Design a binder for this molecule. Sequence first.
Ligand SMILES: CCCCCCCC/C=C/CCCCCCCC(=O)O[C@@H](COC(=O)CCCCCCCCCCCCCCC)COP(=O)([O-])OCC[N+](C)(C)C
Ligand SMILES: CCCCCCCC/C=C/CCCCCCCC(=O)O[C@@H](COC(=O)CCCCCCCCCCCCCCC)COP(=O)([O-])OCC[N+](C)(C)C
Ligand SMILES: CC(C)CCC[C@@H](C)[C@H]1CC[C@H]2[C@@H]3CC=C4C[C@@H](O)CC[C@]4(C)[C@H]3CC[C@]12C
Ligand SMILES: CC(C)CCC[C@@H](C)[C@H]1CC[C@H]2[C@@H]3CC=C4C[C@@H](O)CC[C@]4(C)[C@H]3CC[C@]12C
Lengths: 393, 393
Amino acid sequence: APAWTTFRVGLFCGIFIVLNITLVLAAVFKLETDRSIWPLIRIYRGGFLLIEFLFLLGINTYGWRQAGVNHVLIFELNPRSNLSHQHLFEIAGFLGILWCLSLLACFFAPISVIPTYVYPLALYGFMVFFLINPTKTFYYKSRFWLLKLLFRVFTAPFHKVGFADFWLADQLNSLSVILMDLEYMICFYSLELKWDESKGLLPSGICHKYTYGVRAIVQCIPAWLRFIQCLRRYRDTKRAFPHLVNAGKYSTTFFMVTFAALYSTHKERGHSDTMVFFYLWIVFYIISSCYTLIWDLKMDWGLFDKNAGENTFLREEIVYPQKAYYYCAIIEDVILRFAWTIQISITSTTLLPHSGDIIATVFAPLEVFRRFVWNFFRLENEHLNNCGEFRAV
Amino acid sequence: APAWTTFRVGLFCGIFIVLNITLVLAAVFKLETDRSIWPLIRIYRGGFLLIEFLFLLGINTYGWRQAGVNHVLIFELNPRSNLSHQHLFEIAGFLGILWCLSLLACFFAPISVIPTYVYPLALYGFMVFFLINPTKTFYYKSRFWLLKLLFRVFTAPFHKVGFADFWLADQLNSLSVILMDLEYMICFYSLELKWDESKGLLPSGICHKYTYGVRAIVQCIPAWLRFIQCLRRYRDTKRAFPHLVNAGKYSTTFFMVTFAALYSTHKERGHSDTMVFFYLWIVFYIISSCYTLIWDLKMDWGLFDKNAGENTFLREEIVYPQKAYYYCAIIEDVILRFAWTIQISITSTTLLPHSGDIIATVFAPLEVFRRFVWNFFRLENEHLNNCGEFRAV
Ligand SMILES: CCCCCCCC/C=C/CCCCCCCC(=O)O[C@@H](COC(=O)CCCCCCCCCCCCCCC)COP(=O)([O-])OCC[N+](C)(C)C
Ligand SMILES: CCCCCCCC/C=C/CCCCCCCC(=O)O[C@@H](COC(=O)CCCCCCCCCCCCCCC)COP(=O)([O-])OCC[N+](C)(C)C
Ligand SMILES: CC(C)CCC[C@@H](C)[C@H]1CC[C@H]2[C@@H]3CC=C4C[C@@H](O)CC[C@]4(C)[C@H]3CC[C@]12C
Ligand SMILES: CC(C)CCC[C@@H](C)[C@H]1CC[C@H]2[C@@H]3CC=C4C[C@@H](O)CC[C@]4(C)[C@H]3CC[C@]12C
């Protein structure tokens, strides 16, 4: 990379660091105890998760390049022009500066005239604009490639699946919280925000409950897309394995989230059917967790193979130098696959609100971390032994 | 330069920027009107000027390298392990972060126990330690070369002059304010600071007055070193020109600063000899400015030459692309050589107390800027046509 690119990476990282420190200190001093800070947390959580995802993605690209995994051939990107990790670090740092500035302005009151609710709106409006700018400025080829890919994923039955389509839909399975925060923000300004008050951003009413049957559809949105892609892939190929077995993996989420919305609704009423539904919500919690975990370990990463030989419990060939990495990865995935399922059901109105909001906010970055670790061995098991059969050489 | 070096340059620059912005805002809000902020300004001015000097020096090194001026041969540095501009930018950024942090802590009160006067002391103590660290860490070769050079300059009659000795003594002629701030700080804590009070840094006294006669000797410390070096050069070379004419250039400062302590001293008394002294101070103020300016233009930069030809008013060969640079430089040097002499006389108490401290604080960075511009054409006129007769090829 050129020297100005590394200069810009470091510049944005340093501004981000100091902005974070002053954010924490203003939080522990300037803020006032009486008002509620939760809408404010629920609104900014999505941008935080997006920035973290881009940073971790930049570390993924560095790891793939150094270890020798040909990720340009698998994604079928152009050999000549490709983003390297420094460009991703730069985008992450810039969007992080805007996030820190908007949140800081929401804590302070730098301008009297401007109402506080404007700042959250001004941040997310800018991000959409940067992505959809018509002019050939600011990584225009990257934004255009991403936009064409996004169009194909959201219209799933109609296109032939390629590695990139399959890959982005999975990433969207772990980023579901951003969609929920967006539906929550869209709902909140429309119904529970009083526009007339000068500082109405920090005011419960009905804006954080799975009651109007919308929040369930919103977390089943990515699982539905992957289930549909698996069915289309089965149509073309005509092989029941592994396309019909994989679709079921994605269908388990429907039953589990269906039951959340059911026990919570029955409980809130004076109904005695609540116990029965509670028996079922639990059963479709262990089934889903075990099914996703076994699929991860044996089919996604390709471990526990018969001819492992020396690398015991692993596969025959390994690309990353240390076996410790693989063993820590196995244990980490095992303990975080159990954490993911609980936060999914919980979002759909289960545990009384006071204790629930701190579990989701703590466990969302850990789900992004689990996807970050999943990327390494998935791409490695693709490069070695053609696992998805997307190229079929 | 390696990528980690550029990353570090940008990191320290970004932290420095945000620290400066919060410094300004805390100055215009947190600070209190009743107490005096001048001791606090006179103490930190020296560190500010040192940081600015290092940054501008880094720009000088970039300019010399690109234009093709062999500054490694002139300074006689080792061709294998030289420093580049990025390393200077890095030192400047790091020391600037420490300066901003210490001043910020002096504005706030982050720790109750610690008295405020400790922080100025903690900053300058660290800087000395970084320079004199015995261990081979943190640019140990650079610090050792600089330390040997400094020893030779402060013991001037005893060593043979080389380009590096002559060059550092001149740089010290424009950095005289740092010495004054140091003598002022050394004096202030000892006599006018009441140790018992918790916040006595921002309390007037005898500290800034040129009376005991100490401040005049500190004013003429660098001019004396250059005058002595010129006499030594004439002893070895046996040439009355330009070593006896150049020594006089440096001797004019003695008469100039001797008529400031005198007029100021006579005025404060009920003495009628004050008028006579004032008519002499102006005469030497004007004889010094013209002498230094003519020497600069004709002997240091080598302009106004007879065989200029096409480059009119310039010399025959020019290395920097645009003539506009040379013309702006001539005008800038002409108008700043008049500014330099006023603040030298003024420091030794010529004006009233209120009308003087803002002139020195504004005109000190402009003197550092004039030396920054002087460096380009001095090194260029050395590389072209060997002017100082130091190598004598
Ligand atoms: C909260 C609301 C905010 C709205 C968003 C606002 C902020 C978001 C802003 C985003 C602007 C751009 C962000 C960085 C990505 C740019 C594209 C890119 O990097 O492609 C890289 C591919 O490299 C890879 O193959 C690995 C994948 C990299 C990222 C893939 C998508 C990541 C974003 C997923 C996010 C999903 C979001 C969906 C909804 C959550 C580089 O491609 P290329 O090498 O340049 O290709 C050129 C060669 N070619 C011409 C042949 C193609
Ligand atoms: C009260 C407030 C103040 C309190 C006091 C604070 C004090 C604390 C201050 C701490 C600051 C310490 C600064 C460290 C700088 C390292 C030195 C350096 O860079 O040498 C460079 C010289 O390279 C050149 O000659 C190129 C241009 C000239 C620079 C020479 C002097 C630069 C520093 C002038 C500074 C003037 C400052 C003087 C101050 C009196 C690099 O040398 P090299 O290329 O690595 O040579 C190696 C090859 N060799 C082995 C053959 C040699
Ligand atoms: C239980 C917890 C501690 C498990 C932690 C697992 C994490 C830390 C492990 C699992 C996979 C590991 C990564 C595997 C591959 C690479 C690529 C290599 O070129 C750099 C190290 C890097 C980036 C490893 C970093 C550490 C890593 C992310
Ligand atoms: C009256 C005022 C505005 C005069 C200003 C003069 C200043 C701005 C001029 C005079 C000498 C000039 C420098 C002369 C040489 C170089 C080296 C070249 O490779 C980069 C530009 C640079 C660094 C110039 C920057 C601008 C400069 C510093």
